[PDB]
Every structure is written in C-alpha cells, then in structure tokens.
C-alpha cells in the first residue's frame, strides 16, 4: 500500500548490496586471517562499505538504459510483454536510487584523510624513509592516475546531479517534450560513459597483475564495469 | 532548444577558455622556457581549479551590473538593456553551479598522492637540518580566516538558489521574494569578494607574481565586483 | 516579513550566542589566564564548529518534544498549539545547520596547522627512535562515529527533500506520516549515538572540567536522551 512503485527497485538493490558485502569481507578480512594471521577488522565501517555503493550505483545506472537497447533490437531484428513494461516504468526509481547511492559514495570517499589511521601510516612511512636514507619518494604515473580519475568522477557526479535536479515535478512540468527527452537521454549516456571511464582509469596496472586473484576470484572492478561496457558497445553499434 | 539559455552559456565559454590558456601560459610554459621543468601534472586539477572560481564570481557581478546603470540613467529603454536584464536568473544559476563545482574541487586537495609525497619530502628535509619547530604564525591566521567566509558565502548562495524553485516562489508576497533576491545576493557577493581578497595575503606587493609582464589572476578576478560594490555603497548612502 | 519564521530564529540565535560564549570561555580564556598561551587562532574554525552541531541537534529534539507531551497529558492549551505549529521551521533550520556542520567538519586536514603538527610529530618520532605509532581503539572510534554521522546526515537530507510543496502533494497521508515520523526518529537516534560514540573515554576523565563546568558533549545530549526514553516508555508500558 505504501509506495507501490518503489517496491521492485528497492528489492533489487538490497540483494546486490548483500552480494557485494560478503564478497569484500571474504577477500580483505577472511583471507589475511586464514594465511599469515592478521586481523584487519577495522576496515569494515568505511573501507569495506565504500566498495559497495559505487557498484550498486553503476549497476542501477546500467539497468536504467538496458531496456531501451533491448527494445530497439527487438523492434528492428524480428507489442511488449508485462516484464518489459515494468522495466520501462521502473527507470525513474532506478535512476533516483543510483543518484542517491552515488552521492553517498562521494561523501564517503571525500573523508579518507580525516581518520587517524592515515596519520599513523604517514608517520610510519616518514620514519621508514628517514631510516633508509632515501631522498625522493616521487612517482609520476600514480599521480597522473589519481588526478585523472578524481577529475572524471567529479564531472560525472556533477552531470548526475544536474539530471537529478531536472526531475522535480514542478520543474518537469515546464519544458517541452524535445528538451526533456534531450536532457534525460544525452546527459544520462554521457554520465554513464564518464563513470565507466573513471572506474577504468582507477585501475592503472592491476589488469595484468596475478596477485589480484585472491584465491581464484576476479577483483571487484572487473565485475563493476561488465554491464556498462556492453550497453555502450550496443549503443555505438546501433548508432552506426 | 532552450532559447533563453543561449546567451549566458556563450559568455560562460568565453570567460572559461580565455582563462585556461592564460593559466597554462604562467604555470607550465614559463617554467619550461626558463629553468626547464616538466610541471605537466597540474592540468587535471590545479589548472582547472583556477578557472571555476573566476567564472563563478564574474557571472555573479553581471547580475547586479544592470541595476546600477538603470538608476543612473533614470537620474540623468534600449533593447540591449532589457536583454541584459532578462538573463539575471540564468546568470545566477550558472554562478551557483560553478561555485558548487569549485567548492567540491577545493575540498579534495589533501587526498591526492602528490600531497603525501610532498609531506614525506618536507619531513625528510626538516629532519636533515635539525630544526625542532616548523610552526609559523601569520599563515595559520591567513588560511583559517577566509575558508569560513567562503563557506558562509556558499551557504547564502545555496539558500538563494533554493528560493528560486518555481513551486516555492509562488508562496511569497513578493516582498519577502525581493528581500531574499536582493539583500542576500549582495551579502553573498561581498563575502565572496572579501574571501578572494583575504586569499592573497601579501602577494599584492610581491614582484615575482608578474612572470613576464602579466599580472596575477586574483587581481583580475576582483576588479568588477569592487566597482559594483563601490557604486552600490554610493547609491545607498 | 516571514511571520512564522521569528521564534525559531530567535531560539537559534540565543542558543548560538550562549554556546559561543561558553566555548570561548572554556577553550581560550582559561589557558591564557594560567600558563599563558595565545591559542587565539582557534576561533574562526575550531570554535565555530563546536556551536553548529549543538544548534542542529537541539532544534531536532524540539520537533518531537510536543508530541511526547501531548501523549502524556492525554493518558490543547495555547502554548502547546503554538509549539506544534513551528515544527517544520525547526526541522528546516536543524537540517541547514547539520549541513553546515558537516561541511566545516569535512575540511580539517586541509589547513596548515595540521601540516605543521604532522611535521613536528614526525621529527619528534624520529628523535625518540620510536618505530611503531599504531593505536587501535582511537581508529575504531573514528571509523564508527564518522560512518554514523554520515548515515544520519543522509537520512536528514532525504527527510528535508520530502518537504518540497510540489512533492508533498503526490504523497498520501500514510506515506507522508511514515516518512516524517519514523525516518526523523531514526535520524535523531543516529545523531545521538554519533555524539555518544564521539566521547570515547572522556566520561571518566577529571581534567574535562575547566573549573567546575561539564564539557559540551554532556550538555548536548540531554534532551534527545529524554525524548527517546519517553518514546520507548510510551511504546511499551
């Protein structure tokens, strides 16, 4: 009775969150404890949580635009059923949830240097560098990577914020059909592409690493960008 | 289409690009020409964070610039004046957008690896010279004074932009609307100007700021707002 | 005019002035009077950030206080009604101050006084030949209350978003009541748990009383605890 149209989008997101949580806890806490016993139990409140929000956000963003890709293909290559109609109707809720989780992820990410662990690690690093008579700690490519993906993520968040602001009913009922369609489609595709590029750039050289497979399991950033890449590739194919 | 957004956006382009090529001329090309140094990693963030504040503060000054002209000509209407006065809402919305972007960019400085490497190098250099205290007095005051002013100005801008939602704006009696749209905007512009002025502590008298013959950007940024504020003060008093 | 926005602003101003005077007396005057130390640079940020969280949490507790009293007496006078017609303004002011407090709190590691302290600590650690500087419970505390505060701020943001007049007309009575009551109570509980966790072991510390006065976090969590306790009692007698 309460929020009938919000039942499905909330039922799908939560499960994903669970399927992420027990994954991360299995790769950064249980594994270091099983071999070379070390208790990394202080990473649950922030470090583990921050690996769940972006995945949910990007998955919901991809699910927003998948139904249109399916519909165009079914129209061209050989009415719609009930499931297709529900997918076409739940897009607004999917997008709003994606924006909410993206804002939460950005707020979590902006507060890394505040914690005391960073200060302790910095002091230990300084002491170790002093004790080894090393003058320069500068590294170029890592700095380049950091700057690039930080800027890309900020721009993507700004685009998502604009496209979420334009969804107020009083604001929405003030624009013609063409402008509303343009804003809802082009800006959303651009934001999805920017988020995908940000996630791709975040992983600099871990693609060729073998250590990233903790036991036999691929890392998280490989699964995070599997669906957006497919959506963008199909959109490009239908574009030409 | 957006017919009413055609003019301001174009302006936002001309202010932006002209700034970029300016900053790149003073922070990258000049160190490369003399005392060869790469300095090519500042473009993604450091160079961009010098373009957003200037566009945000230049568009805010253009909102209240037709206001002072209208009073003067009345004491002493063309189509261009009306065209200018019918785009103040768009100018203010763009200014708020760019101010939010600038604040978000500025809040993310300490989380980069360059800061960590610089901190480690500074600690190593301080250890290698036997200096117990690196504390300084005036810089702490300098950097703790203007951050709060910038935050307050951003809060005032956010409130005045929230006031501009069409559903919200029909619940006012136009007196509260006029008060919020005028007084709060003037206070926000003054706060931003003071924040920018306090940012430059003693670089006004420094001679190394002029690389070849060009003045720094904080002198150009606060030119028009000072004139606007002086004219408003003259008119009020 | 804003005839309905007078009493909340007066209450907020009184609370802010009292908290500012109390914090300035506790954190500045006492170190100056005995064992003379300047400590005058803490006013712009470190003192202002001890006032906003108290105003935000005190106004949020006053939203649900009239509801508790009405249930107690039932099991309306003029004062009760005039209190009940200001809850929306109280909540909006509380949200504004909470956002401000979060934004000031997010910008601590950027200032130079942190960098100088870090360099001094590194030099001191090198001088004392100390290899490991790890402490566990401090890290646990930091992570826990930072996460709790962020979650509480998110819930407050959603509750304040729900208050747009054009958005509240598309929600029936049941959904509006649910959102405005349950989520707000959960947010108040999260905020008070955040405040409680912030004070790890200062509850059993003697030097927290400057002369005889309890610290700020003791006063800040008096009303919310009473409100939550009475809600719990009224839920299960």
């Amino acid at each position: 009775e309460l929020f009938p149209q919000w039942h499905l989008p909330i039922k799908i997101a939560a499960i994903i969150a669970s399927l992420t949580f027990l994954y991360t806890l299995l790769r950064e806490v249980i594994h270091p404890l099983a071999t070379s016993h070390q208790q990394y139990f202080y990473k649950i409140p922030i470090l583990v949580i921050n690996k769940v929000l972006p995945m949910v956000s990007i998955t919901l963003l991809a699910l927003v635009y998948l139904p249109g890709v399916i519909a165009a293909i079914v129209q061209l290559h050989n009415k719609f059923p009930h499931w297709l109609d529900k997918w076409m109707l739940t897009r607004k809720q999917f997008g709003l949830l994606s924006f909410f989780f993206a804002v939460l992820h950005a707020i979590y990410s902006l507060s890394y240097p505040m914690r005391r662990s960073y200060r302790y690690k910095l002091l230990n690093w300084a002491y170790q560098q002093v004790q080894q008579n090393k003058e320069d700690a500068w590294i170029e490519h890592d700095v380049w990577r950091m700057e690039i993906y930080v800027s890309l993520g900020i721009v993507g968040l700004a685009i998502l914020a604009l496209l979420a602001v334009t969804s107020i009913p009083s604001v929405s009922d003030s624009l013609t059909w063409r402008e509303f369609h343009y804003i809802q489609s082009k800006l959303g595709i651009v934001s999805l592409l920017l988020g995908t590029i940000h996630a791709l750039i975040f992983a600099w050289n871990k693609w060729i690493d073998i250590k990233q497979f903790v036991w036999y399991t691929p890392p998280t950033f490989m699964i995070a960008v599997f669906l957006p890449i497919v959506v963008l590739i199909f959109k490009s194919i239908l574009f030409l | 289409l957006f017919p009413q957004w055609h003019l301001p956006i174009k302006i936002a382009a001309i202010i932006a690009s002209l700034t970029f090529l300016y900053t790149l001329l003073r922070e990258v090309i000049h160190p490369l020409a003399t005392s060869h140094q790469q300095y090519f990693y500042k473009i993604p963030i450091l160079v961009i964070n010098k373009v957003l504040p200037m566009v945000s503060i230049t568009l805010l000054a253009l909102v209240y610039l037709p206001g002072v002209i209208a009073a003067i000509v009345q004491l002493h209407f063309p189509h261009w004046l009306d065209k200018w006065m019918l785009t103040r809402k768009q100018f203010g919305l763009l200014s708020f957008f760019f101010a939010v972007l600038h604040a978000i960019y500025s809040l993310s400085y300490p989380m980069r690896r360059s800061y960590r490497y610089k901190l480690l190098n500074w600690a190593y250099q301080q250890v290698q010279q036997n200096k117990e205290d690196a504390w300084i007095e005036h810089d702490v005051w300098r950097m703790e004074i203007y951050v709060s002013l910038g935050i307050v100005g951003l809060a005032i801008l956010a409130l005045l932009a929230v006031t501009s939602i069409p559903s919200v704006s029909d619940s006012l009696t136009w007196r509260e609307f006029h008060y919020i749209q005028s007084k709060l905007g003037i206070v926000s512009l003054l706060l931003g100007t003071i924040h920018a002025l306090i940012f430059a502590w003693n670089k006004w008298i420094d001679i190394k700021q002029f690389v070849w013959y060009t003045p720094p950007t904080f002198m150009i940024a606060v030119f028009l707002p000072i004139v606007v504020l002086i004219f408003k003060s003259i008119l009020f008093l | 005019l804003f005839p309905q926005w007078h009493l909340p602003i007066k209450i907020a101003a009184i609370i802010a002035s009292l908290t500012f005077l109390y914090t300035l007396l506790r954190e500045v005057i006492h170190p100056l009077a005995t064992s003379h130390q300047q400590y005058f640079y803490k006013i712009p940020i470190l003192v202002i950030n001890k006032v906003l969280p108290m105003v935000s949490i005190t106004l949020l507790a006053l939203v649900y206080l009239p509801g508790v009293i009405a249930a107690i007496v039932q099991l309306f006078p003029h004062w009760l009604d005039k209190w009940m017609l200001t809850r929306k303004q109280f909540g909006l002011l509380s949200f504004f101050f909470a956002v401000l407090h979060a934004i000031y709190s997010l910008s601590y590691p950027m200032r130079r006084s942190y960098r100088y302290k870090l360099l001094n600590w590194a030099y001191q650690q090198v001088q004392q030949n100390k290899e490991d500087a790890w402490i566990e419970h401090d890290v646990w505390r930091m992570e826990i209350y930072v996460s709790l505060g962020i979650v509480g701020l998110a819930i407050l943001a959603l509750l304040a978003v729900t208050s747009i007049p054009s958005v509240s007309d598309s929600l029936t009575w049941r959904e509006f009541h649910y959102i405005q009551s349950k989520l707000g109570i959960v947010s108040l509980l999260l905020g008070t748990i955040h405040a409680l966790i912030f004070a790890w072991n200062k509850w059993i510390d003697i030097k927290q009383f400057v002369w005889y006065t309890p610290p700020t976090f003791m006063i800040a969590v008096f009303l919310p605890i009473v409100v939550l306790i009475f809600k719990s009692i009224l839920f299960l007698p």
Partner: antibody
Amino acid sequence: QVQLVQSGAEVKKPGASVKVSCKASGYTFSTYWIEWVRQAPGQRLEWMGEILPGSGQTDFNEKFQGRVTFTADTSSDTAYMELSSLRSEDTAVYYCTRWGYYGTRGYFNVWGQGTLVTVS
Amino acid sequence: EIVLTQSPATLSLSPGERATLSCRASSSVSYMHWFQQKPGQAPRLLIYSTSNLASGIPARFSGSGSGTDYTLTISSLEPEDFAVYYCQQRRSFPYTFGQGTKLEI
C-alpha cells in the same frame, strides 16, 4: 668525505668592508643549508646567519640585519659573506658550518677551519 | 631570544674524579646539544639530543635532563678532557650558545 675550506686571515681599517669565502666539497652544494657563525676573543659564540645555496632563501640575525649579506655561486661551489661598516669590535674568527644525519648512525656537524678578521 | 646559562665557572678538579656540568635555560626547550673545544681548534660535537654519543666518542661522557635542566656527567677524568664545554639549543630562530665552562687541574 665532506670538507669545507675558507680563505686566509684579513686585516682592515674602520669604515671598510670584508669578504670571506667558504668552499664545500664532498656533496651536492645546492641542497643543504650553510650557517655562518662568529667567535670573538673572550666572548661566547655568536650565530650570524644561514643561507640555502641554489635558491633564494637567506636568514639573518636581527642585530646584523643591514650590514651583512650572503651570496652563493653554485658553479664554483662557494658561499661568500660580505660585511660592511667594520668597527673596532668586529675582529673575530668566522666559521661556515653544516649539519647532517645518517640513518642508524645519528647526527654529524662539520665546521670550517675559521677565517680571522682583524681591524686596527 | 632564549638565554643559556652554565652554572659552574671553573672546575679545579682532580685528574680521575667525576665532573658535573649544568646548562640551565630560560624557556621551554626540548633537546640540548653539547660541544667541546680545545685551544687552536674549532668546536667538536660531543652529544646530541641529551642522550646520544657522537661517533667515536668514548663512554665516559653522558648526558641527562628535561624541562630546562640539562646535565653533562664525566665518569673518569683521563688527561685528555681538559678543555672548554658549550651547550646549544636549536628551537628558537636565534640559535644561542652557552658561555663556556673551563675545566682545569
């Protein structure tokens, strides 16, 4: 092996100016600070100033601010001190000094042989 | 600036007893450095951080203290430790030296 070599003894008259040189060999001259210290007969050691070769950053004593100056030449790896308006109390010995640290070993301090300046 | 004062003016002490020198300060100073000087030579670093011996320095010399009370202790006086001793602080910008403490027979 780091070493610092200074010039020879100098004799002057009041109202003239004096120049003293310190050449450092054994490390990168344009990275570490060089301090200039003075000792007078029957008096405590006096810390005059500090310079950073290779960049513009020079620290003075309040008393000597306005009479003494420090210059650096990186090509020849030399630091020069110039003092003006010599009085009868400016006869002393001047040293150029440098600190350093080595991991797991500790601090070390290196001094010059000293340049004697007399006035009469 | 910070002024450093050394209490004993001179020590006409037997060749083989123990010696105790003090370098009292006038302001809060974390660490203190001790140098020695012989006629015709530049000062030589002896002790840094009030508890660390320089490379090659024998074990006779020792240092202690905190706050503003710093003490240099000599256990045995071999016929080589007859010189002048100075104390230096490196907290304030003007690095002030001590006045010296001649030790004789």
